[PDB]
Amino acid sequence: NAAYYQVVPVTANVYDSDGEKLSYISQGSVVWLDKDRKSDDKRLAITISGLSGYMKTEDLQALDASKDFIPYYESDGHRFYHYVAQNASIPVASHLSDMEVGKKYYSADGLHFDGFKLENPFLFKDLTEATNYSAEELDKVFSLLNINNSLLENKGATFKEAEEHYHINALYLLAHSALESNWGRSKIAKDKNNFFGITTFDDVDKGILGATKWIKENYIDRGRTFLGNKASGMNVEYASDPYWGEKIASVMMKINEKLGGKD
DSSP letter string, 6-70? EE-SSEEEEE-TTS-EEEEEETT-EEEE-TTS---SSEEEEEETTEEEEEEGGGEEE--TTTS--
Same domain, 25 and 41: yes
By the 8 A CB rule, do 211 and 196 touch? yes
The last residue of one of the domains, among 48, 66, 84, is 66
Q: Comparing C-alpha atoms, which of 153, 158, 159 is closest to residue 130?
A: 159
Q: Comparing C-alpha atoms, which of 139, 136, 120, 152 is closest to residue 226?
A: 120
Same domain, 218 and 233: no
Amino acid at 257: E
With H, G, I as helix, E, B as strand and everything else as coil, classify residue 157: helix
Which resolution in angstroms does this entry have?
1.6
Contacts of 30 by beta carbon, 8 Å cutoff, 6+ apart: 4, 5, 6, 7, 48, 63, 69, 70, 71
By the 8 A CB rule, do 34 and 21 touch? no
By the 8 A CB rule, do 178 and 184 touch? yes
DSSP tag of 187:
H
Same domain, 94 and 44: no
Same domain, 105 and 214: no
| Rounded CA separation 36/32 (Å) | 12
Same domain, 72 and 118: yes
The last residue of one of the domains, among 22, 37, 66, is 66
Q: Comparing C-alpha atoms, which of 53, 115, 49, 52 is closest to residue 82?
A: 49
Q: Which domain holds residue 55?
A: 1-66
| Rounded CA separation 105/261 (Å) | 27
The last residue of one of the domains, among 19, 34, 66, is 66
Kindly calculate the radius of gyration of the chain based on its CA atoms and give it in whole angstroms: 19
As to burial, measured by CB atoms within 10 angstroms (0-12 exposed, 13-18 middle, 19+ buried), residue 148 is exposed
Contacts of 220 by beta carbon, 8 Å cutoff, 6+ apart: 127, 128, 167, 168
- CA-based angle 90:105:234, to the nearest 5? 45
By the 8 A CB rule, do 209 and 176 touch? no
| Rounded CA separation 167/118 (Å) | 27
Same domain, 12 and 122: no
Count CA atoms within 13 Å of residue 74 on its CB side: 13
Same domain, 237 and 120: yes
**Domain total for the chain?**
3
Same domain, 18 and 76: no
Same domain, 173 and 250: no
Same domain, 87 and 197: no
Give me the sheet containing 51-56, strands edge to edge.
Answer: 21-26, 11-15, 51-56, 43-48, 30-33, 4-7, 60-62
Same domain, 137 and 206: yes
Same domain, 232 and 107: yes
| Rounded CA separation 261/141 (Å) | 13
